[PDB]
Amino acid sequence: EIVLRGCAPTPLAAYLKALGVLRLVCEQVDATAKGWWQDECFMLRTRLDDNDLRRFFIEDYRPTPMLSPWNGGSGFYRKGNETAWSTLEKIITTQAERWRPFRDTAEVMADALEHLKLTEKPAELDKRALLARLRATLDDEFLPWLDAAVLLTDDKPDYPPLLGTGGNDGRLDFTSNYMQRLLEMGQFSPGAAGGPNSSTGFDSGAQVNIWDYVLMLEGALLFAATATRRLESADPSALSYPFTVRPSGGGSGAVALGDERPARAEIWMPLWERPASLPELRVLLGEGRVTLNGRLPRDGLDFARAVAKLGTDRGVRAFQRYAFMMRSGKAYLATPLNRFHVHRNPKADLIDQLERGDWLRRFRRAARSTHAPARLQGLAHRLDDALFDLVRVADPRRVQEVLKVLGEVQFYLALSPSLREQVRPVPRLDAHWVEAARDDSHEFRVAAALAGLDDGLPMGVHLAPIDPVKRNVWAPESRLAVWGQGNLSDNLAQVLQRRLLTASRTDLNDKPLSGRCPADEGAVAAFLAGDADERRIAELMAGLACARLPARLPLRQRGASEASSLPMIYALLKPLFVPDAQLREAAVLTPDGCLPLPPALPRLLRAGPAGVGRAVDLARRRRRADGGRLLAALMIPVEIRVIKGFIKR
Known part of the structure; x- marks a missing residue:
């Protein structure tokens, strides 16, 4: 038994890669081999070992001739570019045994397209006619790709979601890329080319693991011809693969509604507990019968409810949910989703x-x-x-x-x-x-700045019984919960005192006060100027501190508060508070070596205008070496450029 640890159940590309490996091994000599999920990985049972498997794929493996005249993928199309032609010519000018199927398939598809007698491309009716002719002229090993990519229907065509518009994206096709990758040896994977969802630092020339792509397309062929219409009602209506319903954004998190609304489809991929041979998988992936009962499972929730009822049959331990989401653009990505459950909720x-x-x-x-x-x-x-x-x-x-x-x-x-x-x-x-619901005003930006702390401890540990380890659960104990009510300044002062005490007891010299959903100088000024809504800020911060923080919401900002009404005292005091790392990055004359805020400063600030004067004198004396709202504003996270602006002034 081989563990394919390069494959985990996600992304969808990996699942399809596992299916492709199993399919190829079975079809080519090792028919009764079996393949099942375990250890966050795919398992294979075969008389190939690791070495036999590698030799198989390096030296013997015939790829499926994925060529699609029904889109720009046969090798013979008006709209296209030179690299694809060079690739197809090189493949046709083969005589290798491994390339024989590609030559035959390309010749046949070229002949069919010529028989269409087109100007540049064929139409939908002509698309169905072309598909029928190809079905009538292709051979056994090709037809799985035809069945997966396209359909023959009674009234109108529709494109299976797994392969885009029929094996095609926009006005170009996956087959040319498949051929180019093969010789080296769109919608493919968010783990490699996803929308902004994770920490930054990556770049490439649209690169992909070539074996991953090839095996993914090879495994996609197991989704078979029984993707029929839901004979329901009385006019032309839904067509889909098995396991197909539109997606809902439950548990999505790193996803935006601008992508949910246009989501092409949602597909539920079964996971199973014991080695399974290819014909059983063909039956399973061909039937996938979650489509019934007059109030049809059009979308994912009905699928989940059927699973809960075991309406989706047992033996399948779990379904990995994938949503084809439009990333606010021209392309769909198969986004994986993590699992949540129906229960009590405020x-x-x-x-x-x-x-x-x-x-x-x-x-x-x-x-x-x-x-x-x-x-x-x-x-x-x-x-x-x-x-x-x-x-x-x-x-x-x-x-x-x-x-x-x-x-x-x-x-x-x-x-x-x-x-x-x-x-x-x-x-x-x-x-x-x-x-x-959505907020993104000055109140919201201040609230998100205060909530989005990332020195390990989330702000929740103060506003609620929370610990960083479980950010959306009845978490373990991080015992800093000293928040309060009403006007916001006093509660922020208490949070600052508790964070300083926790830093001293952990002996964190650099105060854990860095935040990564920050406010702006305008928002801080609006807070300080006496005009922003404190209570809404407090409520929004409490709400934002509740859960695992998403990548980021659609930010839509608003203008700053400034009319000869923005003081300098804030700039004088801020360098004493900012996280030392940041400060050290900042120009400020104050020391770099980290510091628990000078002992008496918060209390002096809270002691009123005379206290503010004393605090200013103390800050002056240290830098040589009204209060409450000013302290609360001093807590707000903002980025280094604002501090540089302060220092310049």
Whole structure:
């Protein structure tokens, strides 16, 4: 038994790579070999060893002739570029035994395309005709790629999501890249080329592990021809692979609603407990029958509920959920998702407001109405998914998802008078939706700066019973919970004192006060000027401290507060507080070696205008070597350029 530790169940590329390895090993001589998940890895049972497997792939492995005239992938297309032609010519000018299938397939597809007699490209009806001809002229080893990439249908074509627009993205195809990688030996992987989700420091010329890509495309072929329509209702309607439903952003976290709304599809990949041979996997991945029962599982939540019911059969231990998300652009990425569960939740109480006047029920009751096309039913399904996700995970982006689906529903209903008649006027909801919903004002930036501390300890350990190890759970004990109520300055002062005490007891000389969702000089000025809303800042900070912090929300900022109303005393005192690392980076004359804030300074600041004068005298004396709001402002995290600006002044 071989452990393919280069493969973990994620990303989707790795799962497909495992399937491709198993498929190739089985098909080519080792038919009854078996392949199952274990140890965060794929397991293979075969009479190949590691060395036999490597020799197989290096010296004998015939790749599947992935060539697609149904898109720009046969090697013969009007719109294209030179490298692809050079590649295809080199492959056609082969006579190697390993390349024979590619030559035959390319010749056949060229002949079919010529038989189309095109100007530049064929149309949808012509696409179906071309697919039929290719099916009638290809051979056994090619047809799995045809079945995976494209469909033959009664009324209109539709493109399976796993391979984009039919093995194609935009106006170009995966087959040319596949060929180029082979000779060296779009939508492919977020682990290599994902949207901004992790710490920075990477660059490449659109590079990918070539074996990963090849084996991924090889494994994608196990998704078979039984991707039929849901014979439901009475007009042309849903087509999909097995295990396919649209995605919901429960547990997504490092994802934005601008990508959820256009999400192409969601696919649930089974994981299983014992070695499984290829034909059983073909049955499993061909049927994947989660499509039934008149209120169809259009989206992921119904799939999850079926899993909970064991409606998705046992033997499959788990499903790895993947969402094809549009990364605010022209491309879709197969984003993996981590797992959360239905349980008690304070933000879930928000949903009760939607139950006022029974609105939600009425809306749901209206959704089936077929005079509203499948769109209304799909929106109702999406709303149910978003609400269940809100119950599962208390996160501002889930609240935003619910609000966005509600807005889309409202727009759709506004376009339909008959539907407008069927639901009574909406009940009043409470302001807590908004406060949990998106915020990004000066209040929000100050709150996120205060909440987004990253010296190990999150701000939660002060505002709530929290510990850094479990940031969205009933966590272990980090005992700094000294927060309070009402106006924000006193509670921030208490947090500063407790952080200084914790630093002294840990003996952290550099105060743990660095934050990485910072405010700005304008936000700090608005706070200091006496005009910003303190209470909303406090509530937003408490909310933001609740969970594992996401990559970042869509930031949409606002202008600074300044009209001859921004003091210098803040600049005089700030260098005494800033994390020493940062300060040392900062020009300030003050020492570099780290420091627990000069002993008496916070108390003097809290002692009022006379106390502020004493604090200024003390700061002057140390640098040679009104209060409360000023202290709270001094706590706010901001970046080094502001400190440089201060020093210049």
